[PDB]
Amino acid sequence: GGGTGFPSKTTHYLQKPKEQAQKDIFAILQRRFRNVYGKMATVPKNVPMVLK
RNA sequence: ACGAGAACAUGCGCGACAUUCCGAAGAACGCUGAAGCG
């Protein structure tokens, strides 16, 4: 379904090492959504932040 | 007062008969209405 989350709808997170995948996802989210992740200085413990 | 004088290169006759512009051919191949959450 729709609204399952960022891990879902994205093959790359599973393939990348947890830390590498988290960094790449944070970079992508900051590139797209600058008003939430763009304001965040560092990578959060979990990327994306919220559970869907 | 000419190898001359008359004297239609003419008459009847259909460019016509038989013919399929057809034969073969997927508008389809891939494509999450989804991501962030303020």
d(CA A4, CA A17): 21
Residue A7: nearest nucleotide (C-alpha to C1'): B35
What is the spatial distance between Cα A51 and Cα A49, in angstroms, rounded to a whole number?
Answer: 7
CA-wise closest residue to A45 among A19, A6, A8? A19
Strand B: which residues have Cβ below 7 Å from it? A 1-6, 8-9, 29, 32-33, 35-37, 48-50, 52
DSSP letter (8 states) at residue A33: -
- Quote the tokens at residue A37: 């992740």
User: Which method was it determined by?
Assistant: cryo-EM
Resolution (A): 2.9
Using only C-alpha atoms, chain A has a radius of gyration, in whole angstroms, of: 11
Contact A43, A22 (CB under 8 A): yes
Report the alpha-carbon angle A29-A8-A19, nearest 5: 55
